[PDB]
C-alpha cells in the first residue's frame, strides 16, 4: 500500500513489499546504482522490505477542438488501467476531476490508460497521435 | 547474381564482428541512459546545504533558517535540470 | 530518433514537499520552458522517424 514510512530516521513514501534480497547482518537499508533507497530492514522484526515509488506519470488531455466539441479523452501515461481504477475507487489520484468510465471507455494503450475514447477495430490514418501505434479522432 | 549473393551473405557477419559501424545507435542509447542517470544522481548532492534530503532539512532547522538550505537545494536541482534539457536540445539537433 | 523523455520539475526538485514547492513557485516559469523543450524534442523525434 502507498504509505509514508519512517524507518529509524529514514523517511520516504512508497509501497513496501516482501523481499528476496538478503542483507549482511549489519547493513540497514539498501541503495540502487544512482543512490536511491530501494530496500529497508524493519528494525523490530528484521524483515527486509522493497520500496516501490507510488505510481505517478503524466496526464494528457485529448480534445477535438473546443469549437468542434467539448468532450475530452484523458491518457494517464505509463500505468495500467487497473491501477488507475483502484486509485479512483480509493480517491487516491492527485487530479480530482476523474472522468466518467462506463466500462467501455477504459482502454489500455502501451502508452498508458486512455479513458473517454472508445476503441474501434478499424484502422484509419492518424489524426491525434496518442502513441505506441494508437491514435485518436473525433468521428461517428 | 552469385556475386550479389556472396556479398549479401557476408553482410550478416561484417555488421557486428568488424565493429566500426553499428556503434552509433548504441552510442545514442548509452548517452540517453547516462544523461538520465546523472540527472537522477544529482539529487544526492548537497550543493552547500546541510543535506540533500528535504525532510532532513525540515526536521533539523527552523523555517527561517531552513529557507536558505532549501533554496540552495532548489538552485542546484534547477541547474541540473537546465543542463539536462540543454544537452538534450543539442543532441536532438544532431539527431535531427 | 532518440529516446523521448519528460520531466516533472515539482517531482524532481521538491518531491512531495509543500514548502519546497512553495519556494519553487517564486522562480516563475523557469519550469514551463523545460516542459515545452522536452515536448518539442519528443514531437521532433516522431517527425524524424
Amino acid at each position: 500500500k502507498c504509505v509514508n514510512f519512517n524507518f529509524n530516521g529514514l523517511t520516504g513514501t512508497g509501497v513496501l513489499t516482501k523481499s528476496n534480497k538478503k542483507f549482511l547482518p549489519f547493513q540497514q537499508f539498501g541503495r540502487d546504482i544512482v543512490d536511491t533507497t530501494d530496500a529497508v530492514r524493519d528494525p523490530q522484526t528484521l524483515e527486509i522490505l522493497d520500496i516501490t515509488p507510488c505510481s505517478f506519470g503524466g496526464v494528457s488531455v485529448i480534445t477535438p477542438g473546443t469549437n468542434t466539441s467539448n468532450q475530452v479523452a484523458v491518457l494517464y501515461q505509463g500505468v495500467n488501467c487497473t491501477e488507475v481504477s483502484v486509485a479512483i475507487h480509493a480517491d487516491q489520484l492527485t487530479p480530482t476531476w476523474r472522468v466518467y468510465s462506463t466500462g467501455s471507455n477504459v482502454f489500455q494503450t502501451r502508452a498508458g490508460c486512455l479513458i473517454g475514447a472508445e476503441y474501434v477495430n478499424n484502422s484509419y490514418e492518424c489524426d491525434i497521435p496518442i502513441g505506441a501505434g494508437i491514435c485518436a479522432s473525433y468521428q461517428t | 547474381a552469385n556475386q550479389f549473393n556472396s556479398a549479401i551473405g557476408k553482410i550478416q557477419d561484417s555488421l557486428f564482428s568488424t565493429a566500426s559501424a553499428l556503434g552509433k545507435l548504441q552510442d545514442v542509447v548509452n548517452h540517453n541512459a547516462q544523461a538520465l542517470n546523472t540527472l537522477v544522481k544529482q539529487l544526492s548532492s548537497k550543493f552547500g546545504a546541510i543535506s540533500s534530503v528535504l525532510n532532513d532539512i525540515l526536521s533539523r532547522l527552523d523555517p527561517p533558517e531552513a529557507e536558505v538550505q532549501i533554496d540552495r537545494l532548489i538552485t542546484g536541482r534547477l541547474q541540473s535540470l537546465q543542463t539536462y534539457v540543454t544537452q538534450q536540445l543539442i543532441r536532438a539537433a544532431e539527431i535531427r | 530518433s532518440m529516446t523521448k523523455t519528460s520531466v516533472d520539475c515539482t517531482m524532481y526538485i521538491c518531491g512531495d514537499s509543500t514548502e519546497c514547492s512553495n519556494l519553487l513557485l517564486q522562480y516563475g516559469s523557469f519550469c514551463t520552458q523545460l516542459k515545452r523543450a522536452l515536448t518539442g524534442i519528443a514531437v521532433e523525434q516522431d517527425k524524424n522517424t
Binding site: 544512482v34 502508452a111 505506441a132 | 537522477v40 | 523521448k4 520531466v7 519528443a42 522517424t49
Partner: peptide, 24 residues
C-alpha cells in the same frame, strides 16, 4: 540493446517497431 523513481518518464515512440518493419 542496453531513473523512473524521481519525476523522469520515458514516452513510447508513435511508430512501434512492427510499423517500422512494415514500412521497411
Amino acid at each position: 540493446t542496453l531513473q523512473k523513481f524521481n519525476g523522469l518518464t520515458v514516452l513510447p515512440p508513435l511508430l512501434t517497431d512492427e510499423m517500422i518493419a512494415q514500412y521497411t
